[PDB]
A paper describes a structure:
The Marasmius oreades agglutinin (MOA) is the holotype of an emerging family of fungal chimerolectins and an active Ca2+/Mn2+-dependent protease, which exhibits a unique papain-like fold with special active site features.
It has been suggested that zinc binds at the catalytic center of PLCPs, directly coordinating the cysteine and histidine side chains of the catalytic dyad. The anomalous difference maps of cadmium-containing crystals (calculated from data collected at 6.0 keV) show a similar feature, consistent with the previously suggested inhibition mechanism. Furthermore, zinc and cadmium inhibit the activity of MOA by forming a tight complex with the catalytic cysteine (Cys215) and histidine (His257), as predicted for papain.
Numbering used by the authors:
A (entry chain AAA), B (entry chain AAA): 2 to 293
Write the structure that this text describes.
C-alpha cells in the first residue's frame, strides 16, 4: 500500500518526474515529464498523497508548491486526455482528482489509475523530453508497459519513522524524552538545510553568554525552517523536518543545544551545529530532550 | 544580601532612577538621576548586578543597554567625584568599578559603596531634576540620608524563581517536564512582550495544518524574543523570559502549543496565545512540557 506522504514520482522507463509545468497554480496547468536532480528540492515535482477514507488504495495528489491537485480533464476515459493541475481539496469526491495507486507487475513501481475513468497516468510514447505530455490512457494493472509505471520516491517521514531514526542513534541519553509537534515531515537534503541556515543570518550571529548562546541558535534554526516551510509551499497537511536537541557530555558536567535532520535513506539522524553549519554523526553530547 | 540580577535602581527620597545618560557606550558617560515610567522597559536605567566571588556583598553594575560599568572617576574619595559609564568586565579587579551593596538603616533600600574609595553613590542634593548629578560622597552605612539610599527594584528571575512560578500554576499536567535553557531572565511587561509579537509579523501569520500551526507560532514567538534580546542589549550573562508550553485539554484528546511569561510580582505565570496576542490565566490546556 502507498503510505500518506510526499513523493517524487519518477517514470520507470526514462528519468522523467511528474512535474506541474512552472509550478503554476492556474487551473488546467499541464502536468508533464521533466528531468530532475537527485538530492535537491525539485520545486515543481513533489506530490502530497492523501488517502481517502472508505476508498481502498485511493488518493488525492496535491502539488506541494502549487497546492493544486492532479486532475484528469473532464474525467474522460479517452486515451490522450489531459492531466492538469486544478483547484480542489484533500478529501474531494471529485473523481477527476481521485487516483487508485497500487504496485505494478514489477512489484516496485506503481500504476496511477483515475478512480472515475479507470484509465492510467501515461508518459505518452515514453518521451524523455522536458515538457512531454502526460495523459490518461487505456491500460491494465498487470502489463509491463513502462509509460504507465511510476516509482513513488518517498521524501517525507511519519513522526513514527522520525522516532525510529532517533531510537536507532547511539548518542541518546538514558533520561531522553522526545516531543512530537507534527505527523508528516519533508526531509531536506543537507544542501537545502544549509541554505535555510545561511538565509536565516545565523552564520553572522555571535555566541553571547545566555543572551544568544546555543539554545538561542538551535531555536532560531528551527523557527527559520518553519518560516521557510510556510513561505515556500502552498500545500497544507505536512511539516518540514528540523529537530532541536539539548545534550550533555560524557562527564555529565556540560549541556549543549543543537539541531538534527535525517539521512537520505530516512533511517538515521545527523546532528547540525547551528553555530558553524557543521553536520556530525557525533557532536560530543547525548540528547536528553528533542522536539521536532 | 543582593542577588545576582537586573535591577531598576530608584532613589528612596525622590522618584529618580540611576540612568546612564542617552544609554551611551562612551567612556565617562555621566550617570544621573532621571524620572521613569513603571511597567515599561526603562532603556537606560537597568543594571546587571554580578557578585564578585571572594569579596562579600560586592558587585560590578553593568548597564544592560550600554554593556559599560558604573565607574567612580579615578576612584577618588573626594565628595562630588563623578560616577560614569566606563568600559570594563563582569569580574574586574578595578575597584573604581566594584560596589559593596547592603541594606540601608530602613532595611528595604540599599547603600552603594565604592569598594576602593568607601564613598557612597549620592543623588547630589536630592535633586529630582532629569539629569541631576550622581557622585561618590562621604557617608555611613547607618545614617537615614535619602540622597544615598536606593531601592533595587528586581527586574529578573533566576531559573529557580521561574520554576517556582510554574509549579504554583494550577494548569500543569501530571506528566509535566520543564527544560531550563538559561540562569537569569529579564521579565518583560506585557506591553513589551506584545510589541515583540507585533514586530515579529506573527499577527499576520495564518494557521495552516502542520505547515504553520500552533507549534510553529509558539516557537516563532520564542525565537523573536531571543532575537530582540540580542539586538536590544549590549550586556551579556542574562536571557529574556519567554516560555514555550505544549498542553492537553481536560478530555485528553487535543494538544496545543502556546507561550507564557511572568506576572509583575514574578510569583506566577500568564499564558500567551501567539495566534491572537491574548494573555490568559487559563488557556484550556494543562502543560505537559515547557522550555524557557
Ligand atoms: C462534474 C463537475 O465537477 C466539478 O467540476 C470539475 C472541476 O472541478 C474542480 O474545479 C472546479 C472549478 O473549476 C471546482 O472548484 C470544483 O470544486 C473542483 O473539484 C475539474 O475537475 C474540471 C477539470 O477536470 O472538470 C470539472 O469541470 C464541479 O465544479 C462542477 O460543478 C461539476 O459538478
Ligand atoms: C510500445 C507499445 O507499448 C504498448 O503501447 C503503448 C500504449 O499502451 C497502452 O495503450 C495501448 C492502447 O494504445 C494498450 O491499451 C496498452 O494495453 C496500454 O498499456 C501507450 O502507453 C502509448 C502512449 O504512451 O504508447 C504505446 O503506444 C503496446 O500496446 C504496443 O503494442 C507497443 O508494444
Ligand atoms: C589605575 C588604572 O586602572 C585602569 O584604569 C582606570 C579605568 O579603567 C578601565 O578603563 C580602562 C581604559 O580607559 C581599561 O579598559 C581598564 O581595563 C578598565 O577597567 C577607569 O576606571 C578610569 C575612570 O575611573 O580610571 C582609571 O583610568 C587601568 O587601565 C590603568 O592602566 C590603571 O591601572
Ligand atoms: C540635608 C543634609 O543631609 C546631610 O547632608 C547631605 C550630604 O550627606 C552626606 O555628606 C555629608 C558631608 O557633606 C555627611 O558626610 C553625611 O554623613 C553624608 O550622608 C550629601 O548627601 C549631600 C550631597 O547630596 O547633600 C546633603 O548635604 C547632612 O549631613 C546635613 O547636615 C543635612 O541634614
Ligand atoms: C524553481 C526553478 O526550479 C528549476 O526549474 C524548473 C524545472 O526543474 C526541474 O528541471 C530542471 C532542469 O530544467 C532540473 O532538472 C531540476 O532539478 C528540476 O527540478 C522544472 O520544474 C520546470 C517545469 O516546471 O520549471 C522550471 O522552473 C530551476 O532550474 C530554476 O532555476 C528554478 O530554481
Ligand atoms: C530609548 C528612549 O527612551 C526614552 O528616553 C530616554 C529617557 O528615559 C526615561 O525618561 C523618560 C522621560 O524623559 C521616561 O520617564 C522613561 O520612562 C524613562 O526610561 C532617559 O533614559 C534619557 C536619559 O538617558 O534618555 C532618553 O533617551 C524615551 O523617552 C525615548 O522616546 C526613547 O524610547
Ligand atoms: Ca503540530
Ligand atoms: Ca539563551
Ligand atoms: Ca543557555
Ligand atoms: Ca507544525
Ligand atoms: Na483509504
Ligand atoms: Na561575593
Amino acid at each position: 500500500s502507498l503510505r500518506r506522504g510526499i513523493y517524487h514520482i519518477e517514470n520507470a522507463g526514462v528519468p522523467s518526474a511528474i512535474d506541474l509545468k512552472d509550478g503554476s497554480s492556474s487551473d488546467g496547468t499541464p502536468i508533464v515529464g521533466w528531468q530532475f536532480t537527485p538530492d535537491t528540492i525539485n520545486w515543481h515535482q513533489l506530490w502530497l498523497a492523501e488517502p481517502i477514507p472508505n476508498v481502498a488504495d485511493t488518493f488525492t495528489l496535491c502539488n506541494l508548491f502549487s497546492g493544486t491537485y492532479m486532475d484528469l480533464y473532464n474525467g474522460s476515459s479517452e486515451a490522450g486526455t489531459a492531466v492538469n493541475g486544478w483547484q480542489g481539496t484533500a478529501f474531494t469526491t471529485n473523481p477527476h482528482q481521485l487516483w487508485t495507486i497500487k504496485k505494478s507487475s514489477d512489484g516496485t513501481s506503481y500504476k496511477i489509475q483515475n478512480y472515475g475513468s479507470k484509465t492510467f497516468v501515461d508518459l505518452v510514447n515514453g518521451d524523455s523530453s522536458d515538457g512531454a505530455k502526460i495523459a490518461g490512457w487505456t491500460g491494465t494493472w498487470d502489463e509491463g508497459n513502462p509509460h504507465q509505471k511510476w516509482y513513488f520516491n518517498r521524501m517525507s517521514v511519519s513522526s513514527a519513522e522520525a522516532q525510529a531514526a532517533i531510537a536507532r542513534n547511539p548518542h541518546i541519553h538514558g533520561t531522553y524524552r522526545g516531543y512530537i509537534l507534527d505527523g508528516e515531515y519533508l526531509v531536506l537534503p543537507n544542501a537545502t538545510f544549509t541554505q535555510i541556515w545561511k538565509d536565516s543570518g545565523l552564520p553572522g550571529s555571535k555566541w553571547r553568554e545566555q543572551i544568544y548562546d546555543c539554545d538561542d541558535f538551535a531555536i532560531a534554526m528551527k523557527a527559520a525552517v518553519g518560516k521557510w516551510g510556510a513561505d515556500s509551499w502552498k500545500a497544507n497537511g505536512f511539516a518540514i523536518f528540523c529537530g532541536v536537541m539539548l545534550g550533555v557530555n560524557k562527564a555529565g558536567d556540560a549541556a549543549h543545544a543543537y539541531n538534527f535532520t535525517l539521512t537520505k535513506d530516512h533511517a538515521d539522524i545527523v546532528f547540525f551545529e547551528p553555530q558553524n553549519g557543521g553536520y556530525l554523526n557525533d557532536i560530543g553530547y547525548d540528547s536528553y530532550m528533542a522536539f521536532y
